[PDB]
Amino acid sequence: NGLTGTGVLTESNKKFLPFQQFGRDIADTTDAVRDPQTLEILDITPCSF
Amino acid sequence: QKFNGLNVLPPLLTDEMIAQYTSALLAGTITS
């Protein structure tokens, strides 16, 4: 959805509202995204450093 | 670890061995 990022995609146990697409934390960074083709929610984990 | 380049490092002394020092000091005080 126009957001470009790099990370590892994993399935999520959280449930969004059917109108929100982006998951954010208190630190205000993107960590959960809804796939545009199929309706599911995925967590993003930065690869190790 | 953390989000953007931040990193936290563990202390050299485990809390268990800290408690061990405290116990040794207390035993020395109460005995000698």
Curated annotation (Swiss-Prot), chain A:
Highest taxon above the source species: Viruses
Effect listed in the UniProt record for changing T4K: In strain: Omicron/BA.1
Assembly behavior: Binds to host ACE2. RBD also interacts with the N-linked glycan on 'Asn-90' of ACE2. Cleavage of S generates a polybasic C-terminal sequence on S1 that binds to host Neuropilin-1 (NRP1) and Neuropilin-2 (NRP2) receptors. Interacts with host integrin alpha-5/beta-1 (ITGA5:ITGB1) and with ACE2 in complex with integrin alpha-5/beta-1 (ITGA5:ITGB1). May interact via cytoplasmic c-terminus with M protein. May interact (via N-terminus) with host bilirubin and biliverdin, thereby preventing antibody binding to the SARS-CoV-2 spike NTD via an allosteric mechanism.
Described purpose of this protein according to its UniProt entry: Attaches the virion to the cell membrane by interacting with host receptor, initiating the infection. The major receptor is host ACE2. When S2/S2' has been cleaved, binding to the receptor triggers direct fusion at the cell membrane. When S2/S2' has not been cleaved, binding to the receptor results in internalization of the virus by endocytosis using host TFRC and GRM2 and leading to fusion of the virion membrane with the host endosomal membrane. Alternatively, may use NRP1/NRP2 and integrin as entry receptors.
Protein's name in the database: Spike protein S1
Taxonomic source organism: Severe acute respiratory syndrome coronavirus 2
From-to range in the entire protein, with total length: 544 to 592 of 1273
UniProtKB/Swiss-Prot annotation, chain B:
Domain of life: Viruses
Role, per record: Subunit of the fusion protein that is processed upon entry into the host cell. Mediates fusion of the virion and cellular membranes by functioning as a class I viral fusion protein. Contains a viral fusion peptide that is unmasked after S2 cleavage. This cleavage can occur at the cell membrane by host TMPRSS2 or during endocytosis by host CSTL. In either case, this triggers an extensive and irreversible conformational change that leads to fusion of the viral envelope with the cellular cytoplasmic membrane, releasing viral genomic RNA into the host cell cytoplasm.
Name of this protein: Spike protein S2'
Species per Swiss-Prot/TrEMBL record: Severe acute respiratory syndrome coronavirus 2 (2019-nCoV)
Residues of the full protein shown: 853 to 884 of 1273
